[PDB]
Structures are given as C-alpha cells and as structure tokens.
Amino acid sequence: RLILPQLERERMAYGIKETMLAKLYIELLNLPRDGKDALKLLNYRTPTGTHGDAGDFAMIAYFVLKPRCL
Amino acid sequence: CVADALILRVRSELSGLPFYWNFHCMLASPSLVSQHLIRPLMGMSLALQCQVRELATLLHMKDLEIQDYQESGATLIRDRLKTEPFEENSFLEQFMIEKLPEACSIGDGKPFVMNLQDLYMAVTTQEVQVG
Amino acid sequence: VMEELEQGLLMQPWAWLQLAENSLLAKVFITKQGYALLVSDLQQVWHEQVDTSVVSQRAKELNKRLTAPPAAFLCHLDNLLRPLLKDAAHPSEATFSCDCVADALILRVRSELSGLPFYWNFHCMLASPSLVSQHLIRPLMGMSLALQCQVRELATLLHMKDLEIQDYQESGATLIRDRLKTEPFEENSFLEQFMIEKLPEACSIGDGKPFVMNLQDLYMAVTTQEVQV
Amino acid sequence: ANLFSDVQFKMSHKRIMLFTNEDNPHGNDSAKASRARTKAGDLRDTGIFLD
Known part of the structure; x- marks a missing residue:
C-alpha cells in the first residue's frame, strides 16, 4: 500500500496536497x-x-x- | 688569487681605446662579513617564516569557510575542485621529504641573486634605520 | 677522529647560552677522542677543536685534585653541557663566563659533580673564513630559498581553495554565518602589506633567541643535505 | 517555539533566557551545532529574543 499508493482504497482521501502540505510544514x-x-x-514551481x-x-x-532532521 | 689577496682585472674600451682597472681586495674583517651577509640572512629567514605562518592561518580560515558552505547543503557543480584539508604537519613533512633537495640548492649563487634581493634590501635598510 | 669531529659539529643545531648578563650561540660536539666547539655573538665567530692530550693537560692544570682519564673527563663535560644546550631552565649547576683578548675568547665553565667542583676553560680563536661560511652563510641561504619555495606552494594551495570557494558561491549557496567570508588572495597585495606592517618586528634577530627557537629543523635538514652532496 | 505558538493572546515581546555554564555544549558533534545554529536563526527570524 506504500509502494503503490494510487491503488489504495481502504484509506480515505488525505485532504492535503502540495499547498496544504507546504503550509503545514511551515507551521510545524x-x-x-x-x-x-x-x-x-x-x-515550488517558480x-x-x-x-x-x-x-x-x-x-x-x-x-x-536536510539541515533540520536526524 | 695570490696569497690572501684577490686582483680583479677589468679591461674595456673607452671610446674604442684601452681602459684598464685592477681591484686589490683583501679578506674582509669578521664584522663586515657579519653585517653584510649573516644578520640580513637571519632576518630574511625569520621574515619568510612569518610569511609562511600567515599563509597557513589564511588557509585555515578558508577551510572554515569551505566547511560552512558544505554544511549549508551547498553542492559544487564541479567535483574535481575539491581540495583536501590543510594540515601543517603533513605539508611540512611532504615538503621536506620531496622538494627540499632542489629548493635548497645554493648552486653558484644565481638563485640568491634572482629570488631574494628585495627582502635582502628591506632587511638591510631596517638594520640601517635601527642603527 | 678529526673528520668525525668536524662532521658532527656540522650536523648539530645551534643553542642559546645565557651568561653573565650576556648571550652567546653555541654548537658543541664532544666524543671520547676530543671535542669541537663553535661560539658566536652575531658579530664574530670562534672555533676550537681539541684532541685528547690537550684535554688531559688542561684537566691536570685546572683541576689539581682531579685524576681521571680523558674519556671520563669528556663524558662528564658532555653530561654537564648537553642538558643546558638542549633545553634551558634545567636544574643543573653550571655557571658560564666570557673574557676577551686581542683575538681570543676564554669561555669559563664552573660546575659541580657529586657536589665537588669542576672547572673547564675553552680557548677559542677566531674561526677561519671557510668554517664561518660553511656553518652560517651557506646553510642560511639554503634555509631562505626553502622558505621561499614553501611560500610559493602555500600560495598555490590558496589559489586552489579560492577557485573552489568561487565555485561554491557560483552554485548560489550562502553561509549560515556571514563572518567567515574571506577576500580573494592576491600575492602582490599580501607582500606589500607584509613589508609595510610586519617586517620590522619579524626581521629583528635580537640576540639570537628567535633563530634558535624557530629555525632549527630546517637548518639541520639543509646542513644534512649539504653533507650528502 | 512550540510553547510560544500555543499562547492565544497577543504577545508584544518574546524572550528566552538560557541559564548555563557550559560554553561548548556540543564539542564532540558538529552536526548538532549546525542544527542548533539553524534553529536559532529561525527563532530570530520569527521574532524571538535569545539571551
């Protein structure tokens, strides 16, 4: 289910894509x-x-x- | 060279006519030899050692800068430019093992005249100014 | 014998001697067959090579109550002198003094072994022009040339590091701490700044202490290279 | 910083005082020092005084 995330059907939609993930990374x-x-x-596209x-x-x-993680 | 003297004979043409001179030199006293060769050479050695120390410190600072840039996540476009860290002991050992023979060759005095003459003049001028 | 003493004296380093509110630079090579000594004060040079018979005669004269073979006397002299020449501040009793004559120099050494007195005198005559040359003039020139070569090598290393730093900057990165930025290295500017600012305090030989403290490994290397060829 | 974020009022000043007697907390590990420097820079950018 992690090698082929596109075929996952048990899990619902995360509700987060590039923009929401970027905002959450900035916040956390x-x-x-x-x-x-x-x-x-x-x-991130510019x-x-x-x-x-x-x-x-x-x-x-x-x-x-890279500089903020173990 | 006869006895302890030296006759330096100079022949030439002054306006196409003979012109002769003969320097009659006698062995220099220990004071002249010292003040003209020994003390200035010691000064030159010490000055060049100080120059080496300053350059070593500059290399250490550039090592610090390179380490900072590497830590910052920077990646060099050309990987061939990487330069190994400078260790004074290793550099000195390699130099004294490999390049000392050729560098130290006094020869007939030509290298001294070619390379070390500005430092010689500076040291002698400082000696004169001091007293 | 004599050749051994000469070669040994050639291969030794200079040492600093403090004595009676004055300074000297000394090189001593002592072996069971004799000894060789070279003294200097940055104005003149003095030399003394002595074989066994002279040592025995002088030892009998000065030390009236000492009766020892020359080998033992030279060994004791070496044990007395080498600690001081190699390193100062040693806890050894050895007082030095110097006199003067028209040409000669009398260097007097007073010490104690087993707490009993022990005197020696060096009667050093002005060194020949060849000896002064071979021991000071040529080795110092070799040292200067070697140091110049070292300076050039370090300049090349600095140029390589400058190119690499330039590449890193061209990549577009920045330092986490900006204080480490170092300006480009130009040899002419560095030499000019050195000659203007630091040369007066770097060229001051003083009384010979800096020479003994700093430039001795290079001196030994140059002299040993000269001995080979 | 997380403690600062939780506060729901309006804070005019934000300050941290570090009581310590170790001048080189991470002398053995260089990576930890770089991480600390990055975090300190981020905190300074956010508007947090460090004393």
Missing part, C-alpha cells in the same frame, strides 16, 4: 512566514531558486529538511 517547523524557505515551498529542482516538491522539501 516554525519557519518564518516570509522567509526564503517558506516562499520556496509555497511557490525556478527563481536556480538550485535543486524547479518542479519537484519532494526534492525541495528534502533540501529544506
């Missing part, structure tokens, strides 16, 4: 609302960062969490 990690990391997570990937939200979150 206590990141600044107007800081660079929050703006990168919210507007390539203004010029680093990592400009379309992948998972990679951006990974880069953000």
Whole structure:
C-alpha cells in the first residue's frame, strides 16, 4: 500500500496536497512566514531558486529538511 | 688569487681605446662579513617564516569557510575542485621529504641573486634605520 | 677522529647560552677522542677543536685534585653541557663566563659533580673564513630559498581553495554565518602589506633567541643535505 | 517555539533566557551545532529574543 499508493482504497482521501502540505510544514517547523524557505515551498514551481529542482516538491522539501532532521 | 689577496682585472674600451682597472681586495674583517651577509640572512629567514605562518592561518580560515558552505547543503557543480584539508604537519613533512633537495640548492649563487634581493634590501635598510 | 669531529659539529643545531648578563650561540660536539666547539655573538665567530692530550693537560692544570682519564673527563663535560644546550631552565649547576683578548675568547665553565667542583676553560680563536661560511652563510641561504619555495606552494594551495570557494558561491549557496567570508588572495597585495606592517618586528634577530627557537629543523635538514652532496 | 505558538493572546515581546555554564555544549558533534545554529536563526527570524 506504500509502494503503490494510487491503488489504495481502504484509506480515505488525505485532504492535503502540495499547498496544504507546504503550509503545514511551515507551521510545524516554525519557519518564518516570509522567509526564503517558506516562499520556496509555497511557490515550488517558480525556478527563481536556480538550485535543486524547479518542479519537484519532494526534492525541495528534502533540501529544506536536510539541515533540520536526524 | 695570490696569497690572501684577490686582483680583479677589468679591461674595456673607452671610446674604442684601452681602459684598464685592477681591484686589490683583501679578506674582509669578521664584522663586515657579519653585517653584510649573516644578520640580513637571519632576518630574511625569520621574515619568510612569518610569511609562511600567515599563509597557513589564511588557509585555515578558508577551510572554515569551505566547511560552512558544505554544511549549508551547498553542492559544487564541479567535483574535481575539491581540495583536501590543510594540515601543517603533513605539508611540512611532504615538503621536506620531496622538494627540499632542489629548493635548497645554493648552486653558484644565481638563485640568491634572482629570488631574494628585495627582502635582502628591506632587511638591510631596517638594520640601517635601527642603527 | 678529526673528520668525525668536524662532521658532527656540522650536523648539530645551534643553542642559546645565557651568561653573565650576556648571550652567546653555541654548537658543541664532544666524543671520547676530543671535542669541537663553535661560539658566536652575531658579530664574530670562534672555533676550537681539541684532541685528547690537550684535554688531559688542561684537566691536570685546572683541576689539581682531579685524576681521571680523558674519556671520563669528556663524558662528564658532555653530561654537564648537553642538558643546558638542549633545553634551558634545567636544574643543573653550571655557571658560564666570557673574557676577551686581542683575538681570543676564554669561555669559563664552573660546575659541580657529586657536589665537588669542576672547572673547564675553552680557548677559542677566531674561526677561519671557510668554517664561518660553511656553518652560517651557506646553510642560511639554503634555509631562505626553502622558505621561499614553501611560500610559493602555500600560495598555490590558496589559489586552489579560492577557485573552489568561487565555485561554491557560483552554485548560489550562502553561509549560515556571514563572518567567515574571506577576500580573494592576491600575492602582490599580501607582500606589500607584509613589508609595510610586519617586517620590522619579524626581521629583528635580537640576540639570537628567535633563530634558535624557530629555525632549527630546517637548518639541520639543509646542513644534512649539504653533507650528502 | 512550540510553547510560544500555543499562547492565544497577543504577545508584544518574546524572550528566552538560557541559564548555563557550559560554553561548548556540543564539542564532540558538529552536526548538532549546525542544527542548533539553524534553529536559532529561525527563532530570530520569527521574532524571538535569545539571551
């Protein structure tokens, strides 16, 4: 059910996608609302960062969490 | 070279006509030799050691900067530019093992004239100014 | 014998001697067959090579009540001198003094062994031009050239690190702490700043202490290299 | 920071005072030091004074 999440039917809809997940990450990690990391997570498609990937939200979150995680 | 003296003979053409001179040098006293060769050379050695120390400190600071950038999650586009951390002991040991012979070759005095002449003049001028 | 003493004296490092409100720089090589000594005060150089018979005669003269073979006397002299030359502040009783004549220098050493007196005198005559050259002038030139080569190597290392830092900055990253930023290294600017600011305090040989404290491993390396060829 | 977030009133100032006598809490581990630096920077950005 984790290798093929698209075929899951027992679990209901999470109700969270890229935007809500970004907001929740900003809230829980206590990141600044107007800081660079929050703006990168919210507007994760704008390539203004010029680093990592400009379309992948998972990679951006990974880069953000790298210095803050065990 | 006859006895303890030295006759330095210079021949030349002044307007196409002969021009001769003969320097009659006698062995220099220990004071002149000291003040002209020994003390300035010690000063040069100490000054160059201080230069080496300053450069080592600068390298340590650049190591700190590189460590900060690496910790910040930065990834270098070219992986070939990575430079190993500087350890003074290792650098000195490798130098004294490999490159000391060629560097230390005094030869006939040419390297001294070519390389170390600004430091020599600076040290001698400081000695004169002091007294 | 004599060749052994000369080579040994060549291979030894310089040591600093404090004596009667004055300073000297000394190199001593003592073996069972004799001894060799080189003294300096940054104005003149003095040398003394002595074989066994002279040692025995002088020992009989000065130490009237001592009766020892030359080998034992030289061994005791080595045990008395080496601790002071190798490192100062040793808890050993050894007083030094210097006199002067038209040319010679008399270096007097008074000490105690088993608490009983022990005197020695070095009658050092002005060193020959060849000895002064081979022991000070050429090794110091070699040391200077080696240090210049070291400076160039460290400059190259700094240039490599500068290029790598430039690459990291071009990647677009930033420091977590901004105080570590270091300006680019230019050799000419560094040399100019050094000559203007730090040279006066770096070129002050003083009374010889800095030379003994800092530049001795390089001196020994250069001299040993010279001995080989 | 989580304690600060729970408060439901309006806070004009936010302050933390650190009572300690260890100048190098993490000398063995460099990663912990970097994590602490990042968290301190985030807290400063949020508007929390550290003394």
